[PDB]
Amino acid sequence: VLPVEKCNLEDSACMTSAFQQALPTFVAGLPDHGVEVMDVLDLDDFAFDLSGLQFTLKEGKLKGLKGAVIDNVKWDLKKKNIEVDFHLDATVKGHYTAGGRILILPITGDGQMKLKLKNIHIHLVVSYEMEKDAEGVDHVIFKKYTVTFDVKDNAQFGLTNLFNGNKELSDTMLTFLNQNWKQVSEEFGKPVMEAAAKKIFKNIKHFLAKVPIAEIANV
């Protein structure tokens, strides 16, 4: 199904390489297997209300996951956790709305978004159980995850139709977001990441649940 060389789980050099070879095929999607495309990833509609900003995103897209570099995969067979560190550049797009304020500036907006995130580092931890199925085939079954993020290099904000078309105000806001990009990544990044992470997690869990572990590991 997926092109992956078989590792011992505690050989982290190997696992980091296997994840790296699998990832692009995987994120392309596996229609017949019930695995959605994850680059470009369709994010489900969401909203958030945080630190004075009422935000929504519709027709959400996350681009970039097909080019992620896996930094390390640490498998702890004792605790039955997997730690996966990786980084990428990502673009988040869609029909956004904004009201309230961002930090010290009031905002209104109803238009299109293009967020370009450069060298975002992600720290994923998954909990899993090994589970034999009804016909006796052992599977890795994902149970929970945590994900943290750190945008190290830069984040760029493209927001159309801010301030009902007023250039002056839109220009001031856009300059403002790019100058304080880090702060803004830390204030509002979590709900965005979570929109992607829950969908990505669903599909990995679905996939691993159905593919025998012996097909993708030395167990």
Ligand X SMILES: COC1=C(OC)C(=O)C(C/C=C(\C)CC/C=C(\C)CC/C=C(\C)CC/C=C(\C)CC/C=C(\C)CC/C=C(\C)CC/C=C(\C)CCC=C(C)C)=C(C)C1=O
Interacting residues toward ligand X by CB under 6 A? 2, 4, 7, 15, 18-19, 22-23, 26, 55, 62, 65, 84, 86, 90, 92, 96, 98, 102, 107, 113, 115, 117, 120, 122, 124, 140, 147, 149, 151, 155, 159, 184-185, 188-189, 192-193, 196-197, 200-201, 204, 208, 216-217
Q: Which C-beta is closer to ligand X: that of 106 or that of 134?
A: 106
The residue among 2 and 137 lying less far from ligand X, judged by its C-beta, is 2
DSSP for 20-78? HHHHHHHHH-BGGGTB--BTTEEEPPEEEEETTEEEEEEEEEEE-GGGPEEEEEEEETT
What span, in angstroms and rounded, lies between the C-alpha atoms of 156 and 144? 31
Least distance in Å: CB of 22 to ligand X?
3
| CB-closest chain residue to ligand X | 22
Q: Which is nearer to ligand X, 26 or 134 (CB)?
A: 26
* CA distance from start to end of the chain: 18
Q: Determine the Cα–Cα distance for residues 167 and 10; give it in Å rounded to an integer.
A: 56
Task: Supply the minimum distance, in Å, between the C-beta of residue 158 and ligand X.
Answer: 9
Q: Which two tokens stand for residue 87?
A: 């980084």
C-beta closer to ligand X: residue 17 or 136: 17
- Least distance to ligand X, CB of residue 31, Å: 16
Beta partners for 111? 96
For every residue of 139-157, DSSP letters joined together read: EEEEEEEEEEEEEEEEEEE
Q: Is there a cis peptide before residue 192, judged by omega within 30 degrees of 0?
A: no
Residue 135 CB, shortest distance to ligand X, in Å, is 20
CB of 174 to ligand X, least distance (A): 9
- Alpha-carbon distance of 202 to 94, in angstroms, equals 22
Residue closer to ligand X, measured from CB, 169 or 208: 208
